C-alpha cells in the first residue's frame, strides 16, 4: 500500500515551492592589412 509521510508537514512542504537550495544537479545546464591578407 501507499506509505504516508507523517511529520510536521511544513518540513516536507518547504522543498515544494521556494527553498533557496538551487541546482545540486548536473542535468541540462549548458591585424594588419598586408599581414592578414
Amino acid at each position: 500500500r501507499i506509505t504516508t509521510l507523517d511529520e510536521t508537514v511544513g518540513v516536507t512542504m518547504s522543498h515544494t515551492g521556494m527553498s533557496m537550495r538551487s541546482d545540486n544537479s548536473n542535468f541540462l545546464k549548458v591585424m594588419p592589412k598586408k599581414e592578414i591578407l
Binding site: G17, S25, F27, L28, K29, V30
Partner: protein, 92 residues
Amino acid sequence: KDQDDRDHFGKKRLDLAGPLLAQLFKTLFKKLTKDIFRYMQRTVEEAHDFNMKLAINAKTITSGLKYALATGNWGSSRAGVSQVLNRYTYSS
C-alpha cells in the same frame, strides 16, 4: 433462442467514486506527462538550465480536481455527476 434484452439488470454496471475517479485521474496525469516533456524539449532547444520545479505544474492536478467536483460535469462529455448533500432531515 430469442433476442438479447438490454433491460436485464446484471448486464449493466455501476460506477462509484473509484472507477469514476480512474477516468479523471488518468486524463489529468496524461496532460501533465506531456507538458513535463514540453519542458524537456524546449530546455534543450532554447539552451537553458533545467528546473524540476518549473518542470511540473501542480495546477494540472489542482485545477482539475477542484473544477470537476465543483460542477456536475466530469469532462461536455458527462454531466450531473455531483450534487449537493440533502439535509432537510436525517432521513434525507
